[PDB]
Every structure is written in C-alpha cells, then in structure tokens.
Design a binder for this molecule. Structure first.
Ligand SMILES: *C(=O)CCCC(=O)N/N=C/c1ccc(C(=O)O)cc1
Length: 103
C-alpha cells in the first residue's frame, strides 16, 4: 500500500511418506540471533522441488520457507542441524512451511 509493502502469507503443513530408494524430492538451502520478518520468515527455504516428487505431490513448492520439522521449530536453526533433523525421521517427514508473495 501507500504506507508499506503488502503480502499474502500461506502456511502449509504436510506429511511426507517416501520409499527407501528415493528422496523427499527437494533441495534445502540456508539463507544465512535472527528475527523473522514477512520478507524473510526463516533461515532455511526450498531452493528447488522436484516436479512430481514426494514433496511436490504433497504441496511443497520452490521458495517455501521452513518453520517446523517433526514438531520442532527450525525458524532460527542452522542448515546442517535442520538437514540432520530431517534425516532423523527416515522415510517420514512432517513439515510446516510458509509461502510468501510480495507486492
Ligand atoms: C544444498 O546442496 C543446497 C545448497 C548448498 C550449497 O550451495 N553449498 N555450497 C557450499 C559452498 C561452500 C564453500 C564454497 C567456497 O568457499 O568455495 C562454495 C560453496
């Protein structure tokens, strides 16, 4: 608006169940105490998502920011620690993300 940026923020929580011989189908990237902002809500985001893969079919998309992994908040958690948390769940991953559109 005239006084500042307007955004739509969509939260998505999904259950990923994969097979032993595949990945969840996404590439995680760390952007950098940290204070979340609308434009920058979390440290880790989906740099890419394999179209038709497990993560895609559940509704995850490139650019989604990761908020929680398996009931633990990861908004302020570094890249290697989040990767490890995801691998701890094996073939199951419950994740909450936020998608942000800026105008
Ligand atoms: C995971 O694969 C998603 C992106 C991760 C990534 O881009 N890692 N790159 C790391 C890296 C570390 C050091 C250098 C360097 O100093 O030359 C470059 C890239």
């Amino acid at each position: 608006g005239p006084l500042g940026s307007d955004y739509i923020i969509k939260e998505k929580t999904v259950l990923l169940q994969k097979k032993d011989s595949e990945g969840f189908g996404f590439v995680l990237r760390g952007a950098k105490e940290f204070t979340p902002t609308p434009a920058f809500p979390a440290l880790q985001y989906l740099e890419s998502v394999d179209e038709g893969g497990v993560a895609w079919r559940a509704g995850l998309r490139m650019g989604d920011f990761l908020i929680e992994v398996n009931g633990q908040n990861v908004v302020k958690v570094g890249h290697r620690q989040v990767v490890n948390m995801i691998r701890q769940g094996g073939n199951t991953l419950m994740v909450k993300v936020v998608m942000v559109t800026r105008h």
